[PDB]
């Protein structure tokens, strides 16, 4: 680390005046504001502007996750793969430490900002705010203040901040949560940091900004299509856009199921890794879909289209997702979901034969000082079982089942209530390597598939998607409402789930194996699943075949 | 002042330099090689101009302020805006305005060279400054299968040279991407503050970025939704999106028709103005008005439930603030170019008819020039800019008239047409959009090419209030292809045009009457249009 010593990750140091401060919902935090906003903007701006040799630079911190796969804090890189854990049971705990690192670095930069900028009269007051600040989370599954949305702050190119010593003075500055921008294309950074979808041709992170058939200089900064991201985040079955039907965002239904379903062991909950389908709704699968929906992954689509609903961006891409500032807010909420699930599943910690094996893994590259052995070591999962050992908390884990229902279950229950006491789910199992490491999206349909439109909620008969953000991998989709609509159109027949595997060119991959099945139970989930139909690959138009 | 507008001064090493297509120019600047000197000059000069203070009348703000809000003086002329809309001096007033912008930028380029270029490189940089002219945006040309905003306009940053540091290239905010002030424009010092659409709450110009039901802080900079603007620019009948149907962007057909239809007088060509025929209602200003709408967006909300949100408003749709968006000038550069083309193939038609004749001698306030006969400072008049080359610029397409009709055909190439006659003040001066349909109108979707049976639109670029007495506005739409499809689907029935008048809230203004008619080829009137009702939740 800096100074040639390991960087010890502690979380923000304990101050008895500041007992377990909470990580707040970033929309709530923003709306209530403004010293903490100022501190966060100014500190993160400094961190983003730090040199590439500075290991606490935003680029280097993002770089721990994936590309450009260099060392960090003396820990060799070049494994290509990054330090991040994906498709394994230490997914939640590796990221718990990662998110704490980011938060700690920000806090330390806040302290430096105060020392260099804040007059004597205000220093204790600014330090108090730095000490009470924690990294906000993005609640991707909560309705914004009828729909899910990206954080308000993320959709603002500029932000007004205080100017210490100039009371009332405010200045509008570039918002470091809107994008991460470098001084040149990331493909041309000094060795060994070059990033080399045309991500090499990006200077800034983008959401849905990268499309084929535009000048390559447009990719330098493809912009933040936050409206398109919001639309994706609100994915739901296609039939729900017809008159006479109510919609439910699939992401909120999934998250409510995740938090409320009992009986999963840690290995089931923690990861997509697969080595009963009812238990395949897992944290990592939901997190993977959100990555897709925020960033976009399709660069192109075959044929002629005036309205272009595709476009790719950093959040969909494992190697470069960590550069988008929303990455950290996303992972802060994944940490929060982990803490919530831990709270209502108190005994289920690396408790199954498969995850037990990974419990003791070093969470490289993150260092801590072991007090018992007097050695600098790597974090291990047990070190962060209690997130409060890192000196943060969440309001929801301060005391939880009613909160979960209030935040994530109202609309699902409101709409499910209109239909019979049955549940349906879709099980999805695939290999993350079926396209040679390349990402892909699995779309499921009930009924005939439009051979030129097999993509999203506007696609005829669309039920839902599973994103391969990249042993097998599993996910699960709600299917109850989509089955009801199908049955009403088909004399009560159970639909055959039809699936298309879509690549980044918007083309259907015919040799990617996906095991899809529909399962039914009597009774609603939020109050015995049997398989009722086997999936089948759908064919698409010849011009849309990979 | 007075600030004498002359165009860029003549230099014999630079004979009548052309205003280039901005995509061609951008590609020349960035592709031929690394010596992107004009690109650097334009970016650096426009940045300087944009950062000048409000009390500098050659600041970007004040130049844009000539057109509309905040309606102040300019060049000692007391300050509705100075801009001419809905009159036959529309092309000439703007010809001078675009020249002012070009000249101020050129002067700033010279200042940039004096400040930043070493003595030994001054001649090279001056040469490029003297060759540069304001590029035009060819809104009707297929971008290098679809019409598009300029490449450069869609780029948040642009790399520029640093004079004296070869290979010291540097990425800088692109002043063509947006105009950004340091504070919200509703809070500027008096008398400059901008105070239906929350433009007072913008710090930056935006395309489709203002939508209801988002936090107001989002409006400070609503972004540049250039993909959405491109979609609008490629407006065409709804049926062309059905499987098996080729599409043709209406804007290109309109532009082709404008340039190639013979026999218009100046009053017909120059303006939407109709002073109390239909074949001759395809005019320059109407096309220009639709392009404003398509670039900026004018609808702030939409009634009802919509997952996909295709609305959103922005500066270019709004008369009082459109000039702040840097693309405004590029648009107007092409409108000037279309005027020059039309003049070239209609060379006797210049304020030549008893309608436009009286406007010929209007002073084009606030623009000053030096009179050589009286040795006096006077206002520009239309006749002064009849030959645009007197302002020391040209266009490639008019520098060689010989092949102009083929060039027009290459770039932009029974009949049915739609005639549209409307009052700009049908909603007291507020903007609106006239959408025309063949067939049943969807009561919840009556907006654009995704709306069932949509055929085309006419945008009222306007913004206790009435029009000048005896004056209305006209536009024309192509309808041939749309009538073919409608007949094919409807047992050969000639469609009755159905129209909806949409306001900035996405609601239908049921009390607005517009004269819409369908004509067929000598065109005969074959059907009169009728307003269509929409859902009750969508009615104004
Ligand atoms: O996983 O980011
Ligand atoms: Cu992630
Ligand atoms: Cu105007
Ligand atoms: Cu205009």
CA A495 to each of CA A96, A218, A243, A520: distance values in angstroms, whole numbers, following the listed order: 40, 43, 22, 12
Looking at the structure, tell me whether residues A455 and A331 fall in a common domain: no
What CATH number has the domain bearing residue B530? 2.60.310.20
* Number of other residues whose CB lies within 10 A of the CB of residue A303: 11
Burial of B73: CB neighbours in 10 Å, binned 0-12, 13-18, 19+: middle
CB contact under 8 A, A218 and B171: no
Looking at the structure, tell me whether residues B379 and B423 fall in a common domain: no
Beta strand pairing status for A530-534 and B298-299? Answer: unpaired
Contact B54, B188 (CB under 8 A): yes
Contact B507, B300 (CB under 8 A): no
Phi, psi of B36 (to 5 degrees): -75, 55
Beta strand pairing status for A273-274 and B454-460? Answer: unpaired
Tokens of A215: 């000048």
Q: How many residues does chain B have?
A: 540
Compute, in degrees rounded to 10, the torsion defined by CA atoms B15, B21, B24, B29.
60
Going by C-alpha positions, the residue among A339, A177, A351 that lies closest to residue A263 is A351
First vs last C-alpha separation in chain A: 46
Contact A132, A36 (CB under 8 A): yes
Residue carrying the six token digits 């992954």? A297
What is d(CA A304, CA A521) in angstroms, rounded to the nearest whole number? 43
Looking at the structure, tell me whether residues B453 and B535 fall in a common domain: yes
Looking at the structure, tell me whether residues B489 and B525 fall in a common domain: yes
Q: Which atom of ligand 1 is nearest the CA belonging to A291?
A: 2
Looking at the structure, tell me whether residues B469 and B363 fall in a common domain: no
Experimental technique behind these coordinates = X-ray
Alpha helices in A345-409 (DSSP H): 353-356, 401-404
Contact B245, B489 (CB under 8 A): no
Q: Which atom of ligand 1 is nearest the CA belonging to A284?
A: 1
Ligand 3 center to B83 CA (angstroms):
6
- Tell me, letter by letter, the H, E, C secondary structure of A256-298: HHHHHCCCCCHHHHHCCEECCHHHCCCHHHHHHHHHHHHHCEE
Which residue among A152, A181, A304 sits closest to B217, beta carbon to beta carbon?
A: A152
What is d(CA B372, CA B377) in angstroms, rounded to the nearest whole number? 9
What residues in chain A have their Cβ under 8 A from chain B's Cβ atoms? 31, 146, 152, 155-159, 171-172, 181, 183-184, 203-204, 211, 214-215, 217-218, 220-221, 223-227, 231, 234, 236, 241, 247, 304, 306-308, 311, 452, 457-458
What sign does the CA torsion over B210, B213, B219, B223 have? negative
CB contact under 8 A, B154 and A225: no
What is d(CA A268, CA B361) in angstroms, rounded to the nearest whole number? 82
Q: What share of chain A is helix, strand, coil (3-state, %, to 5)?
A: 35, 15, 45
- Tell me, letter by letter, the H, E, C secondary structure of A163-223: CCCCCCCEEEEECCCCCCECCCCHHHCCCCCCCCCCHHHCCECCECCECCCCCHHHHHHCC
CB contact under 8 A, B203 and A172: yes
Looking at the structure, tell me whether residues B389 and B445 fall in a common domain: no
What is d(CA A422, CA B11) in angstroms, rounded to the nearest whole number? 83
Going by C-alpha positions, the residue among B284, B298, B296, B175 that lies closest to residue B233 is B296
What CATH number has the domain bearing residue A387? 1.10.1280.10
Tokens of A404: 């979960």
What is d(CA A296, CA A312) in angstroms, rounded to the nearest whole number? 4
Beta strand pairing status for A536-537 and A497-502? Answer: parallel
What is the DSSP-derived secondary structure letter of residue B401?
Answer: G
Contact B319, B232 (CB under 8 A): no
Q: Kindly report whether the peptide bond that precedes residue B2 is cis, defined as omega within 30 degrees of 0.
A: yes
Looking at the structure, tell me whether residues B424 and B537 fall in a common domain: yes
> Domain span at residue A100?
1-409
Residue carrying the six token digits 């000249």? B103
Domain final residue pick, A409, A426, A443: A409
Contact A529, A521 (CB under 8 A): yes
What is d(CA B19, CA A392) in angstroms, rounded to the nearest whole number? 61
CA B12 to each of CA A247, A277, B108, B128, B392: distance values in angstroms, whole numbers, following the listed order: 69, 81, 21, 14, 11
CA A307 to each of CA A304, A353, B228, B248: distance values in angstroms, whole numbers, following the listed order: 9, 50, 8, 15
Tokens of B57: 């009348």
What is the DSSP-derived secondary structure letter of residue B241?
Answer: G
Name, in order, each residue with C-beta under 8 angstroms of B195's C-beta and a sequence gap of 6 or more.
B70, B186
Ligand nearest to the CA of B69: 3
Q: What share of chain B is helix, strand, coil (3-state, %, to 5)?
A: 35, 15, 45
CB of A339 shorter than 6 A to ligand 1: no
CB of A64 shorter than 6 A to ligand 1: no
What is d(CA A416, CA A286) in angstroms, rounded to the nearest whole number? 21
Contact B373, B381 (CB under 8 A): no
What residues in chain B have their Cβ under 8 A from chain A's Cβ atoms? 26-27, 30, 145-146, 151, 154-158, 170-171, 182-183, 203-204, 211, 214-215, 217-218, 220-221, 223-227, 231, 234, 236, 241, 243, 247, 305, 307-309, 312, 449-450
Phi, psi of B473 (to 5 degrees): -135, 145
Q: In what order do the strands lie in the sheet with A462-468?
A: A462-468, A440-446, A497-502, A536-537
* Number of other residues whose CB lies within 10 A of the CB of residue B444: 17
- Tell me, letter by letter, the H, E, C secondary structure of A74-90: CECCCCCCCCCCCCCCC
What is the DSSP-derived secondary structure letter of residue B440?
Answer: P
Going by C-alpha positions, the residue among A385, A364, A396 that lies closest to residue A101 is A364
Going by C-alpha positions, the residue among A211, A187, A212, A182 that lies closest to residue A201 is A187
Tally of domains in chain B: 2
Beta strand pairing status for B497-502 and B530-531? Answer: parallel
Ligand 3 center to A169 CA (angstroms):
36
| Long-range contacts of A462-466, Cβ-Cβ distance < 8 Å, separation of 24 or more | A462/A237, A462/A238, A463/A237, A463/A238, A463/A426, A463/A497, A464/A235, A464/A236, A464/A237, A464/A250, A464/A426, A465/A235, A465/A289, A465/A292, A465/A441, A466/A285, A466/A288, A466/A289, A466/A428, A466/A430, A466/A441, A466/A442
Going by C-alpha positions, the residue among B43, B232, B245 that lies closest to residue B148 is B232
Looking at the structure, tell me whether residues A346 and A231 fall in a common domain: yes
Contact B20, B151 (CB under 8 A): no
* Number of other residues whose CB lies within 10 A of the CB of residue B376: 9
What is d(CA A124, CA B197) in angstroms, rounded to the nearest whole number? 43
Phi, psi of B336 (to 5 degrees): -65, -40
Q: Which residue of B36, B155, B160 is the best one to mutate when testing the A interface, meaning the one whose CB has the most A CBs within 10 A? A: B155
What is d(CA A66, CA A331) in angstroms, rounded to the nearest whole number? 15
- Tell me, letter by letter, the H, E, C secondary structure of A478-511: ECHHHHHHHHHHCCCCCCCEEEEEECCCCCECCC
Contact A389, A383 (CB under 8 A): yes
Domain final residue pick, A364, A380, A409: A409
What is the DSSP-derived secondary structure letter of residue A328?
Answer: H
Classify A34 as helix, strand or coil: coil
Closest chain A residue to B226 measured between Cα atoms? A223
What is d(CA B356, CA B322) in angstroms, rounded to the nearest whole number? 26
CA A388 to each of CA A29, A43, A109, A131, B310: distance values in angstroms, whole numbers, following the listed order: 20, 24, 22, 15, 44
| Long-range contacts of A415-421, Cβ-Cβ distance < 8 Å, separation of 24 or more | A415/A246, A415/A247, A415/A248, A415/A481, A416/A248, A416/A480, A416/A481, A416/A524, A416/A526, A418/A246, A419/A480, A419/A481, A419/A484, A420/A484, A421/A522, A421/A523, A421/A524, A421/A527
What is d(CA A237, CA A249) in angstroms, rounded to the nearest whole number? 9
CB of A86 shorter than 6 A to ligand 1: yes
Q: Across chain B, which distance is largest between two alpha carbons, in Å?
A: 76
Contact B287, B476 (CB under 8 A): no
Going by C-alpha positions, the residue among A72, A429, A409 that lies closest to residue A258 is A409
CB pairs under 8 A between A and B: 90
Looking at the structure, tell me whether residues A342 and A470 fall in a common domain: no
What is d(CA A197, CA A505) in angstroms, rounded to the nearest whole number? 10
What is d(CA B526, CA B515) in angstroms, rounded to the nearest whole number? 14
What is d(CA B446, CA B453) in angstroms, rounded to the nearest whole number? 9
Classify A383 as helix, strand or coil: helix
Which residue among A157, A184, A211 sits closest to B171, beta carbon to beta carbon?
A: A184
What is d(CA B411, CA B413) in angstroms, rounded to the nearest whole number? 6
Domain final residue pick, B390, B413, B436: B413
Classify B134 as helix, strand or coil: coil
Looking at the structure, tell me whether residues B286 and B332 fall in a common domain: yes
Contact B58, B65 (CB under 8 A): no
What is d(CA B176, CA A56) in angstroms, rounded to the nearest whole number? 35
Going by C-alpha positions, the residue among A134, A95, A114, A109 that lies closest to residue A2 is A109
Looking at the structure, tell me whether residues A417 and A369 fall in a common domain: no
Looking at the structure, tell me whether residues A300 and A443 fall in a common domain: no
Contact B312, B208 (CB under 8 A): yes
């Amino acid at each position: 680390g800096p100074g040639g010593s390991p960087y010890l990750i502690t979380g923000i140091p304990k101050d008895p005046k500041h007992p377990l401060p909470i990580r707040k919902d970033i929309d709530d935090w923003y709306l209530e504001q403004r010293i903490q906003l100022t501190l966060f903007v100014e500190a993160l701006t400094v961190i983003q502007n730090r040199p590439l040799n500075d290991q606490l630079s935003y680029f280097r911190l993002a770089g721990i996750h994936g590309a450009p796969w260099t060392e960090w804090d003396g820990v060799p890189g070049g494994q290509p793969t990054g330090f991040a854990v994906h498709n394994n049971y230490t997914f939640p705990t590796w990221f718990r430490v990662y998110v704490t690192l980011y938060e700690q670095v920000i806090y330390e930069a806040m302290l430096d900002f105060i020392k260099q900028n804040v007059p004597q009269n205000g220093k204790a007051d600014w330090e108090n705010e730095a000490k009470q600040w924690r990294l906000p989370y993005w609640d991707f599954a909560r309705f914004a203040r009828d729909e899910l949305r990206l954080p308000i702050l993320v959709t603002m190119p500029m932000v007004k901040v205080l100017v210490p010593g100039q009371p009332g003075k405010q200045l509008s500055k570039p918002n470091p949560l809107y994008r991460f921008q470098m001084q040149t294309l990331m493909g041309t950074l000094e060795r060994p940091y070059a990033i080399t979808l045309p991500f090499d041709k990006c200077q800034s992170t983008t959401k849905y900004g990268l499309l084929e058939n535009y000048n390559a200089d447009v990719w330098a900064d493809g912009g933040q299509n936050w409206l398109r991201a919001n639309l994706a985040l609100n994915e739901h079955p296609w039939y729900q856009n017809l008159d006479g039907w109510d919609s439910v965002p699939t992401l909120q239904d999934m998250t409510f199921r995740l938090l409320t379903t009992g009986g999963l062991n840690w290995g089931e909950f923690s990861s997509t890794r697969y080595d009963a389908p009812k238990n395949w709704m897992n944290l990592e699968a939901i997190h993977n879909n959100v990555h897709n929906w925020v960033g976009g992954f399709m660069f192109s689509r075959p044929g002629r289209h005036d309205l272009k609903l595709w476009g790719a961006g950093h959040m969909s891409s494992v190697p470069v997702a960590a550069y988008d500032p929303i990455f950290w807010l996303h992972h802060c909420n994944i940490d929060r979901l982990t803490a919530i699930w831990q709270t209502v599943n108190s005994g289920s910690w690396f408790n199954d034969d498969k995850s037990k094996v990974s419990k003791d893994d070093d969470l490289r590259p993150f260092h801590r000082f072991c007090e018992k052995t007097r050695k600098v070591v790597f974090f291990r999962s047990d070190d962060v079982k209690d997130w409060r050992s890192l000196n943060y908390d969440y309001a929801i884990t301060k005391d939880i089942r009613k909160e979960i229902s209030d935040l994530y279950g109202q609309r699902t229950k409101e709409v499910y209530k209109d239909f019979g006491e049955e549940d349906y789910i879709l099980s999805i199992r695939y290999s993350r390597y079926a396209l040679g490491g390349k990402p892909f999206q699995i779309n499921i349909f009930f009924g005939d598939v439009d051979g030129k439109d097999f993509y999203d909620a506007r696609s005829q008969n669309f039920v839902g998607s599973v994103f391969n953000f990249s042993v097998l991998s599993v996910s699960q989709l709600p299917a109850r409402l989509a089955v009801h609509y199908y049955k009403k159109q088909n004399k009560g027949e159970v639909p055959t789930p039809r699936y298309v595997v879509v690549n980044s060119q918007g083309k259907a991959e015919a040799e990617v194996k996906v095991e899809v099945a529909l399962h039914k139970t009597e009774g609603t989930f939020y109050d015995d699943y049997r398989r009722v139909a086997d999936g089948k690959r759908a064919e698409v138009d010849d011009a849309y075949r990979a």
